[PDB]
Amino acid sequence: TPREVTLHFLRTAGHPLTRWALQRQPPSPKQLEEEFLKIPSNFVSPEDLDIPGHASKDRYKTILPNPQSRVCLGRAQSQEDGDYINANYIRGYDGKEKVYIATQGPMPNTVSDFWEMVWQEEVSLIVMLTQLCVHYWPTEEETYGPFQIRIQDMKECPEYTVRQLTIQYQEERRSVKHILFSAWPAHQTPESAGPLLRLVAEVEESPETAAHPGPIVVHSSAGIGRTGCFIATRIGCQQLKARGEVDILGIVCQLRLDRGGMIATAEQYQFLHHTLALYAGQLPEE
């Protein structure tokens, strides 16, 4: 029943706020921290995961992908026998399936796994959140297992770099857009929310380039704190734009059902409210 209690909370908690309340009368910092601390982590224990050999492919022993939503790799790697990657499908706006994949930053031994996921899930956009983990993309051209990656273009913006990559598997070539957002330390927040919202706009402006729409890959070293903050921000912006309201509690609860631990800190939860209040004031009108 501890698990039942956890799952019931995450399915039912909610604090919808009109855009006016968000902008002009938000909950206090102490209210937001108390609210955040009530949310169950929904972390899976190593004992809950029966996937032999998975440990060598996790950056952090206690940060594991929930089994019901984990990404399983197909058999495109002739070198390895398992289907394991530390990554989860994440629902988006109104619970839409597989809008994102949240994953840890690749380690040297999981770089081929990462590109296999990108290929198999027809990913066309990767969002990386860091404070400037191995570089898994080339300066010019590298081969990772059966995948050749080449940089086609690279452009610099304030606080993010856009790379346009090509991924080749056999005679097939695909385009992948890669955005590296570079001033977000682990367990903390950016000093301002302006750049983050430009990153959100960059993401929204990105064309679909795959055969079928695929998840957006979002990662940061653990795949939960900054990763969770980014996805929550995008979903929150979508709610504000479509409905003139936002339920940030319910967004974080929906993310935690998909991957344990999403949004790592009360300060991050507070910054999420600030960022969304900023998005609300930037919305078009008079």
Side-chain angles (χ1 to χ4, degrees), residues 1-67 69-77 81-140 142-149 151 153-158 160-170 172-204 206-207 209-211 213-286:
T1 215
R3 194 173 183 255
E4 299 178 333
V5 175
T6 284
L7 297 175
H8 178 264
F9 181 105
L10 292 168
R11 288 175 181 143
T12 62
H15 189 171
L17 297 164
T18 59
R19 99 176 246 199
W20 183 93
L22 177 68
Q23 295 181 264
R24 299 284 173 91
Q25 200 177 61
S28 69
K30 180 182 164 183
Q31 282 173 318
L32 292 183
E33 179 183 48
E34 290 172 338
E35 181 173 283
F36 178 78
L37 290 174
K38 291 181 192 294
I39 311 167
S41 289
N42 201 33
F43 277 133
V44 298
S45 75
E47 299 89 6
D48 290 338
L49 210 64
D50 189 354
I51 306 167
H54 78 82
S56 64
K57 296 172 174 290
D58 302 313
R59 183 171 300 275
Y60 307 103
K61 301 182 173 194
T62 61
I63 303 166
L64 304 174
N66 301 62
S69 58
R70 75 177 181 101
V71 186
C72 305
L73 298 181
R75 289 218 262 170
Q77 279 183 72
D81 53 358
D83 71 3
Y84 187 82
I85 189 174
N86 197 316
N88 290 93
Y89 297 111
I90 313 290
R91 292 174 292 160
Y93 184 76
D94 277 356
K96 177 179 179 58
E97 304 292 326
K98 306 184 160 179
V99 180
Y100 316 85
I101 289 164
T103 192
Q104 63 180 23
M107 299 187 289
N109 66 312
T110 70
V111 169
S112 298
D113 296 335
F114 177 87
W115 290 116
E116 175 174 9
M117 180 172 68
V118 162
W119 187 267
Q120 159 195 318
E121 303 295 313
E122 310 188 66
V123 166
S124 48
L125 181 62
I126 298 166
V127 176
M128 169 170 174
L129 316 143
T130 196
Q131 170 65 83
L132 279 184
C133 298
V134 64
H135 289 192
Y136 57 87
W137 65 88
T139 310
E140 291 150 65
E142 298 297 326
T143 298
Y144 307 101
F147 309 101
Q148 183 173 261
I149 321 287
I151 317 286
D153 315 270
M154 167 174 147
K155 76 176 169 178
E156 299 290 352
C157 304
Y160 68 83
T161 306
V162 177
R163 283 166 177 92
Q164 293 283 6
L165 325 177
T166 283
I167 173 170
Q168 192 186 300
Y169 179 72
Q170 290 164 16
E172 202 184 337
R173 273 160 294 258
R174 300 177 181 169
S175 192
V176 184
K177 183 179 173 170
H178 181 279
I179 311 165
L180 200 168
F181 180 93
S182 36
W184 202 334
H187 203 86
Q188 301 175 40
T189 64
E191 298 267 44
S192 71
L196 176 56
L197 293 183
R198 289 187 298 101
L199 174 62
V200 174
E202 184 73 42
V203 168
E204 254 141 36
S206 301
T209 56
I216 298 158
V217 167
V218 182
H219 74 83
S220 55
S221 61
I224 54 162
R226 289 168 285 180
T227 291
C229 293
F230 173 76
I231 296 172
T233 297
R234 177 142 185 261
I235 294 167
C237 292
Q238 292 170 316
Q239 290 186 9
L240 289 166
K241 185 178 170 64
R243 308 202 292 240
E245 51 189 89
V246 66
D247 185 356
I248 297 158
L249 179 51
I251 293 168
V252 177
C253 289
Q254 180 187 282
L255 296 183
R256 300 225 169 147
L257 284 161
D258 294 337
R259 177 171 173 90
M262 302 279 277
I263 298 89
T265 258
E267 177 181 49
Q268 288 175 353
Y269 194 66
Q270 288 166 347
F271 184 75
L272 176 53
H273 286 71
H274 173 257
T275 299
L276 291 169
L278 184 56
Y279 179 81
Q282 297 186 341
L283 274 170
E285 246 28 301
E286 190 231 80

